[PDB]
Amino acid sequence: ISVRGLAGVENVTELKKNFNRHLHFTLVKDRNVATPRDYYFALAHTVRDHLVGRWIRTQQHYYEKDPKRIYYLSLEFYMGRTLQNTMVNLALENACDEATYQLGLDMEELEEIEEDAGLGNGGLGRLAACFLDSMATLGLAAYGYGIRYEFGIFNQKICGGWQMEEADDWLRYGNPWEKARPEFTLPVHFYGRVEHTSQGAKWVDTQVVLAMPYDTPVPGYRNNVVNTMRLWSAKAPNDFNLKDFNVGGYIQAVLDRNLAENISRVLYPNDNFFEGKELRLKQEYFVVAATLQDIIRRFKSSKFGCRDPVRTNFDAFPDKVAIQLNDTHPSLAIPELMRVLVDLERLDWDKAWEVTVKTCAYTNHTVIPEALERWPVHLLETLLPRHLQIIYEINQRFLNRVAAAFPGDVDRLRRMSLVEEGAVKRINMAHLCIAGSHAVNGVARIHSEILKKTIFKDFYELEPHKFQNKTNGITPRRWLVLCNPGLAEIIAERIGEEYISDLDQLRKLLSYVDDEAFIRDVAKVKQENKLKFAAYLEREYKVHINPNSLFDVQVKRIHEYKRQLLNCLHVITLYNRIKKEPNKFVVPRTVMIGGKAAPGYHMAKMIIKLITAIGDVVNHDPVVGDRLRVIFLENYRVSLAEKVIPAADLSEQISTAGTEASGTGNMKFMLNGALTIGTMDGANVEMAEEAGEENFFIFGMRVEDVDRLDQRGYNAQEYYDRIPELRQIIEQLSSGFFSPKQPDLFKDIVNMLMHHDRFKVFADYEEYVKCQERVSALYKNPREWTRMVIRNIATSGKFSSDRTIAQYAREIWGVEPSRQRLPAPDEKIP
Amino acid sequence: ISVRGLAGVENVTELKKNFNRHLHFTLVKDRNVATPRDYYFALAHTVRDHLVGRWIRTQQHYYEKDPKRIYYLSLEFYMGRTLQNTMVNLALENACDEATYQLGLDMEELEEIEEDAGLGNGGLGRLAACFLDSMATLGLAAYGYGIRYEFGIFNQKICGGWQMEEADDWLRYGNPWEKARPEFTLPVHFYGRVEHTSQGAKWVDTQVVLAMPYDTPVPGYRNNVVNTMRLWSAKAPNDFNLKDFNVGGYIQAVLDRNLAENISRVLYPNDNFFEGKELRLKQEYFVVAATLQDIIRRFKSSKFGCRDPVRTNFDAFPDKVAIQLNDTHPSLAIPELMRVLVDLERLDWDKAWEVTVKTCAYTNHTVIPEALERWPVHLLETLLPRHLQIIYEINQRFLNRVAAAFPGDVDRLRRMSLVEEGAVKRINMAHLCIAGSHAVNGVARIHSEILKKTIFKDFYELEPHKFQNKTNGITPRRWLVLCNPGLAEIIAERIGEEYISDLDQLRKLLSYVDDEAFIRDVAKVKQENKLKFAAYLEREYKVHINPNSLFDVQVKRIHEYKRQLLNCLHVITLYNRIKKEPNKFVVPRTVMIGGKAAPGYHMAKMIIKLITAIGDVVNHDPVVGDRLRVIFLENYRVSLAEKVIPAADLSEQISTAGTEASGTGNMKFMLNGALTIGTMDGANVEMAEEAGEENFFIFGMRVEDVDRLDQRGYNAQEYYDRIPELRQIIEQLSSGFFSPKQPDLFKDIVNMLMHHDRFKVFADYEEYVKCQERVSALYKNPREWTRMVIRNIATSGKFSSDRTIAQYAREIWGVEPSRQRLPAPDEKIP
Ligand SMILES: O=c1[nH]cnc2c1ncn2[C@@H]1O[C@H](COP(=O)(O)O)[C@@H](O)[C@H]1O
Ligand SMILES: O=c1[nH]cnc2c1ncn2[C@@H]1O[C@H](COP(=O)(O)O)[C@@H](O)[C@H]1O
Ligand SMILES: OC[C@H]1O[C@H](O)[C@H](O)[C@@H](O)[C@@H]1O
């Protein structure tokens, strides 16, 4: 059937009776009233049963051996569905497929019923999810720590061509994967004040919110390792949230509990944008305060909570603990670690600071100013009084370090301050993370260089040893084996299965680049993929596309820096050229654009409306025929990505050079048989470097050119004046060609493009369409297109998150990865 | 061990492996980290497994056979713990006791970990719980319908002698008994307006709240019948509760969902008191609207949703459906049934009314005015516009009926109106229920007569056939076998086990009233019970009592009509008599008073403070010694009642004659070996009638005397003037003898007692203490006391809820009870 494992006789029979046990005892249903949703749950519970045994021994193991622990703190974990992925990592897919088949059910139909775990916005949240999978696969004693939002990223609906947001009630029917652990509930404090008495400061008169943990198993790829992702949920204490007496109403007091619990109610839908709301800050401290108590409790036990030197010596803390900060969102972990050590454990400042800097590391994901977290001091002052004091003290000593290193450099002092003066005083969270971490890394080579040359130049000059790079990667399990079994199978037929956990082995596919059967096969799976997607389209969304055309797809969050607008300009150019010479041959294309816009991002929402508006015109022009279709992919999410990526021919990574830190979707497309058209930005550089620039469609300005233009001054009018085709498009938008009933509908886009384009769309226009003509030319030669595809796939090995994680482990965490199978799952009951 | 069933070889082994399966696969724990709470859950899940098979066939059965369905609507279901009760009804107690013992665990210790399901206030909510158990035991196709509050009755804490209320988070650790059924979620409407168009009225522009059901199994006693209790939970739609666009905030919209969901957040802590809040009215309609749609869906299928006459003829509706209204709380079911039939199904008014009156029946529980539900019209007008219109129309036609029957009786017309004029117009919910029901019943003989003679006299004259009586009862399973196995065992030793489902058989115990061994045994189990309670007291609450003393206990909600104050007066009298003649012998007593006061009931809370204040003085007077102790039983609830009742010697049922509708705690004490001191009120009359007045301690005014006094005019000063002992007590309270630091602390109680005593405490004082002297005299003669106890126990059979339910079934519902074992639980999987 494929290498989805063995469909053993004993195990298919075992799976079937357990499926029936659950459908009866767990779901309390009988075959006669069972619906596909019930069947999905019976299966999910049956599959979950297979990893509890391994989950228990993995955790018991870490307790016995006591290795260095890796804590990955993140406010986002973009998990997606977990049924298939669990089957894949446990080599259960074929057995389950067989068993359900014999039960008379279609497994693929049941998989579609699982709701996505959309506790993420985009790139940052998915990275965390890919990292978790890789850390388990590399046998690291790693824990994912976050917030269990009851509402993840909103579900996007397109009404009248506009995005409509609606609550994502992903827990509506229940989550069979998580395990509530009310017994490990912890208290988290807010507000209060600081008392300075005799031997130390005291955080007093605080409001208490409880953090209840929920554990979800994270299985490694076929190694019997099942790590843990602990997600915190907010709960109100039943005392003060009722007991602070003297009138108000008993009923009201109980109803007001949903004020402390709102902390974990919903994820902020912002991607690469900072919003200074109090609720966000509370979420950020909530996850940090709860996680750290857990981290210290585990350390106090270790082997020190037995003997060792005997005396809670936190000197070994950094040898037993490593906490990675996914962006600055969990940055309060630094001053919180200091507060505990100094205020509670009573260590001297300097010893505590040494420990804190040695266990913390920070990962930066963007260079755009609006994405940077700068919290107003009055907010920190009211909500976290003691943390503000600790931050001021950290700033004081850090700045003394700078003054001592750069005597008389008074401007450098204000530039590096953690405290920003002006309208309102703010705390620069990024400066805080650099100061309190022993490592700071970028997510792609060029991004990491940009951090050193620009944004964090002063900090780099002070401590050059702190700055590193760790190019992002994606997990080949979910992004290859799970979503594209067809491609995984033909690769396995030639080079075996070891590449699934050793992606570098794909290089061996280079020797089949002239193999006639392989070229035919690679080309065949892509065609089968396109046919399946074209079908899904009519199934769930309804209104035909042509599977023979070039599948041009750009899927990512809607942003001005990602330039979906530059894509739009090309689409309109194609349309106008066809209308000018209707009976001339052009390579057919289906251009699909998908992605979500943050609710308050007006420009992003206006761009989604432009895309649909273009589709309204293009898709109904008889002269165009089937040569050009414009489709907006609704509700782009992880499970949707697993469907479009394997079906793409062209991947669009066209952000303005220097703005996309790394990008990971690009990697997903490369490993799945899509060719890439993009700018020398983010990881695109490393990908073209790996496959060879000849097998990549690079165009536009390089970082240097963008800077040259800024010195000069960007004037869009110039481009408008010298390019008739561009002029024609802007006048079409301006006059209502794409919006008849509301002719001035797109005035904000035209106005922006002409007068305030921060990402110089017009400057890359000419080179972009010229380059697009080149991919069309190559698509006309199926054999050469496929041969170039093989060159990309065979060279994508470097972009596996196993490689990224191995580097983090060795160069930052100080731990050694291991592909050693944990001692089976075998029963056991001590 | 006892007749807790057989501890079979095959089954104890089966129980043990399943206990381990759950502890591993369900709880995801290993013996090395498992706590008593984990062990309790492993067991609960193991026991729950045994009734899912029976639950599924019971429900499938009712679908095949299609009998008349009984729907018991109630806003309160005071369930308590469900582990032991399930074991008892499934004959699993000894097997589980053995199995856990072999696992090295104490089952009794694990049972104490289960949280009570306190979704009730007192008498009314517990009645519903006892009824559910009896309906299952009598094989009726009955469904309990209510609200799944996430916070039940508050947990009472005594601080400084004052009651402190704290949220009852009973779901904190999860509920292993319920089964969420998100697939049967239903919509409920609120607000909106009424459009009158061409062919009928339309309820339009409403706000939608979803009702998600949760089913809990209700097993009958050893007959394989497992009925269902469906509890609704409020959920917000993800559309409008987000989709009603045009600014407000995406985040705020999601947080505001907890506004629709507050409907099922908390139970109103009022016992026999009406509070006209909007949130209460919403709860009342919510349970009614959701339940009815379910009822009609089930009817539309039946055998009509196949063939029958073919044409949705609702003429047979009353033949297939019976809905019982537990008080007026679910009274909106009447106008809601009319709305659906008339507005949606399009039946003519008269046909619809005939159907509604024929399927609905109402149960009244109190005669006090402040307990009566009178909803302001402006509230109904805004929240339920169409229901107000239907109510006005029902009133119009009903009053025409009255005018036609009593020509010219213009006062009768205003008295019987469903609409009350005055300050604010109100709807009298009780008048609504009488008009729209074919049966109205009291809960005790005297209460039912009082309804006919007083409160509902006009309605009785109009339709005498509607008024019935159904004396309350309690379930002998939880209130005898479960809480007092020792007593159940010695009864079984002489007359067998058939009395558990045929309580009348206890009469056979009358022939052992002179049996020397039985007297000794009855007396022995009571002593063992007292010793166990005296122990629990020091275990969980801490500060000694004497098990040889007379256990004087009054446990019920704190009310002025229940007269805990009259009890207090006696306690103080005993104290003063001892202090007057210290070296005189008096029968030792431990008087325990327990119960909760509604949060806003100032007088009730002042009474709890008086009780503790008396204890502060009495319990620390060296001259008193161990002859008199005053203890306030904290957090009185179902699980606490199962502990005190079996240990009581004297039961206090001293409400003012004519105020306690029935009472059920009295019945609990009688069946468990306690003698009763009380007034001729509620069921007390029927109990003294059954055991013989000579075996009952009756005192005080009869209903007639109370009325005579009211004609005359009650003057407390008179009693104060002629009774020195009474005078001495009032002056003690007035001068601060019981409150030194705050001498005027009890001025409100004294003021009330002297000037506004609605329940004439002083009028029954003399006869009450005189009577109390008589029980002391009899307690001095152990043999005669026990012989009288046997006379009560042997004659308590009439007070089983099986008898009550059989009468409801025959005289109201039109169904026949059946003690037929359903065809085993046996596997099966169609
Ligand atoms: O005190 C202990 N004794 C025995 N095993 C323990 C103890 N603490 C943790 N463990 C084991 O380690 C796993 C890790 O627990 P955690 O990391 O503290 O959440 C547990 O589920 C147990 O198997
Ligand atoms: O349409 C049907 N076909 C077969 N069995 C049904 C059907 N509807 C209800 N049942 C059975 O009746 C039980 C009662 O369901 P309910 O009373 O509608 O909640 C179900 O769990 C099924 O066993
Ligand atoms: O590092 C993970 C991701 O974080 C953010 O989403 C960045 O915008 C993206 O470039 C990067 O790939």
Ligand SMILES: OC[C@H]1O[C@H](O)[C@H](O)[C@@H](O)[C@@H]1O
């Ligand atoms: O009918 C059940 C119970 O309802 C109320 O609680 C009444 O006050 C009580 O007398 C009665 O026993």
Ligand SMILES: O=P([O-])([O-])F
């Ligand atoms: O949106 P991206 O693929 O750059 F993360």
Ligand SMILES: O=P([O-])([O-])F
């Ligand atoms: O409180 P009661 O026992 O009358 F129900």
